[PDB]
Design an enzyme around this catalytic site. Structure first.
Site, PDB file in Angstrom:
ATOM      1  N   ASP A 177       0.960  -0.996   0.079  1.00  0.00           N
ATOM      2  CA  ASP A 177       0.157  -0.084   0.017  1.00  0.00           C
ATOM      3  C   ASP A 177       0.912   1.298   0.097  1.00  0.00           C
ATOM      4  O   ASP A 177       0.639   2.177   0.618  1.00  0.00           O
ATOM      5  CB  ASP A 177      -0.990  -0.085   1.149  1.00  0.00           C
ATOM      6  CG  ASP A 177      -1.996   0.860   0.975  1.00  0.00           C
ATOM      7  OD1 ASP A 177      -2.544   1.380   0.033  1.00  0.00           O
ATOM      8  OD2 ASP A 177      -2.952   1.069   2.114  1.00  0.00           O
TER       9      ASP A 177
ATOM     10  N   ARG B 149      -0.141   8.997   0.583  1.00  0.00           N
ATOM     11  CA  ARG B 149      -1.057   9.325   1.713  1.00  0.00           C
ATOM     12  C   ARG B 149      -0.493   8.351   2.918  1.00  0.00           C
ATOM     13  O   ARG B 149      -0.762   8.917   4.180  1.00  0.00           O
ATOM     14  CB  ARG B 149      -2.502   8.914   1.549  1.00  0.00           C
ATOM     15  CG  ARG B 149      -2.795   7.467   1.220  1.00  0.00           C
ATOM     16  CD  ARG B 149      -4.307   7.183   0.540  1.00  0.00           C
ATOM     17  NE  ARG B 149      -4.147   5.627   0.341  1.00  0.00           N
ATOM     18  CZ  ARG B 149      -3.652   5.170  -0.912  1.00  0.00           C
ATOM     19  NH1 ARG B 149      -3.099   6.050  -1.737  1.00  0.00           N
ATOM     20  NH2 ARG B 149      -3.888   3.962  -1.247  1.00  0.00           N
ATOM     21  N   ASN B 150       0.502   7.356   2.642  1.00  0.00           N
ATOM     22  CA  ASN B 150       1.026   6.529   3.520  1.00  0.00           C
ATOM     23  C   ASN B 150       2.444   6.928   3.820  1.00  0.00           C
ATOM     24  O   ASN B 150       3.143   6.205   4.545  1.00  0.00           O
ATOM     25  CB  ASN B 150       0.803   5.168   3.299  1.00  0.00           C
ATOM     26  CG  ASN B 150      -0.692   4.549   3.392  1.00  0.00           C
ATOM     27  OD1 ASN B 150      -1.489   5.134   4.038  1.00  0.00           O
ATOM     28  ND2 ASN B 150      -1.340   3.610   2.533  1.00  0.00           N
TER      29      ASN B 150
ATOM     30  N   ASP C  45       1.831   3.165   7.810  1.00  0.00           N
ATOM     31  CA  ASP C  45       0.802   2.302   7.440  1.00  0.00           C
ATOM     32  C   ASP C  45       0.850   1.043   6.833  1.00  0.00           C
ATOM     33  O   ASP C  45       0.767   0.751   5.664  1.00  0.00           O
ATOM     34  CB  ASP C  45      -0.239   2.982   6.548  1.00  0.00           C
ATOM     35  CG  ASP C  45      -1.601   2.681   6.516  1.00  0.00           C
ATOM     36  OD1 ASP C  45      -1.816   1.503   7.430  1.00  0.00           O
ATOM     37  OD2 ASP C  45      -2.577   2.972   5.884  1.00  0.00           O
TER      38      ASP C  45
END
Length: 282
Positions: free
Chosen positions: A142, A146-147, A160
């Site tokens: 992932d 955003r992580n 994350d």
């Protein structure tokens, strides 16, 4: 060397934790910031997550599981796990404080306001953390802007690990097609993160239908060069997005490419030329 786990997480004494500020809600409970008093009596800022009252065992397992993974990594570009609180409730996960939050949101607030060398530094930190992840045999699955979290000094760190051992826009074609998740699929995702950074947080493939993201990328279409994007960095994106996973660079090679650009910043002055649309290969 990537493997309940207090195997990889310190049990903190809740007397050493103070909550200074509630940020908001998370998947598992509240998200807060505060201070942690270390055994040496040094006080540091920390991010604090709690597990909601009335949690199910599934929620507890998934909540603490993400800490068990993060706790395996000790690296300047991977978010530091300070510890957990499990012997009292609410259960807590305490991590490194990152003042500037998620990289995608932060960049969207500062469109075109950083230097190319500042952006390349952010990207090199991300690659350095990912290189260690891959050295340890972990696949993130992932990796997206955003992580990635960014601190007061613009140092970026991988966060994350909920999905780590489908965000379709960040996922390599083989991972979408038959769940073939490897370090080379993480290199694909890094290529998207590179585009995200150089684009100041625009959304990969904007709001194209998911079926169209899958098909367009299969046909050989790729995200276009961001405005004012150095040629070297667009080429690096294209290399990350090679159809054949075996032809993509390794994270170690990516770090070395970026170190060379940092060493010779004039390299970056060669820009790609000149409609949110995809380019065939290219």
């Amino acid at each position: 060397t990537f493997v309940t786990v207090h195997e990889f997480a310190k049990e903190l004494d809740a007397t050493n934790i103070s909550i200074d500020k509630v940020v908001g809600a998370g998947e598992f409970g509240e998200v807060c910031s505060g201070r942690l008093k270390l055994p040496s009596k040094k006080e540091i800022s920390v991010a604090i997550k709690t597990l909601k009252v009335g949690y199910t065992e599934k929620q507890r397992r998934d909540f603490l599981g993400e800490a068990s993974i993060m706790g395996q990594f000790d690296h300047p570009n991977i978010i530091r796990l300070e510890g957990v609180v499990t012997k009292s409730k609410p259960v807590m996960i305490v991590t490194e404080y990152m003042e500037n939050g998620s990289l995608d949101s932060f960049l969207r607030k500062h469109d075109a306001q950083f230097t190319v060398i500042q952006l390349v530094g952010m990207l090199r930190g991300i690659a350095s953390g990912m290189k260690y992840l891959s050295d340890m045999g972990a696949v993130h699955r992932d990796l997206a802007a955003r992580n990635i979290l960014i601190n007061s000094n613009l140092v970026c760190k991988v966060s994350d690990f909920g999905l780590s051992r489908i965000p379709i826009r960040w996922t390599s074609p083989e991972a979408i097609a038959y769940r073939k998740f490897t370090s080379a699929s993480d290199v694909w995702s890094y290529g998207i993160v590179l585009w995200e950074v150089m684009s100041y947080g625009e959304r990969p493939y904007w709001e194209m239908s998911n079926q169209d993201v899958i098909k367009a990328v299969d046909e050989g279409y790729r995200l276009p060069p961001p405005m004012d994007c150095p040629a070297a960095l667009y080429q690096l994106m294209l290399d990350c997005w090679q159809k054949d996973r075996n032809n993509r660079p390794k994270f170690e090679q990516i770090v070395s490419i970026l170190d060379k650009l940092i060493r010779n910043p004039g390299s970056l002055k060669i820009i790609t030329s000149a409609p949110s649309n995809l380019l065939l290969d290219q």
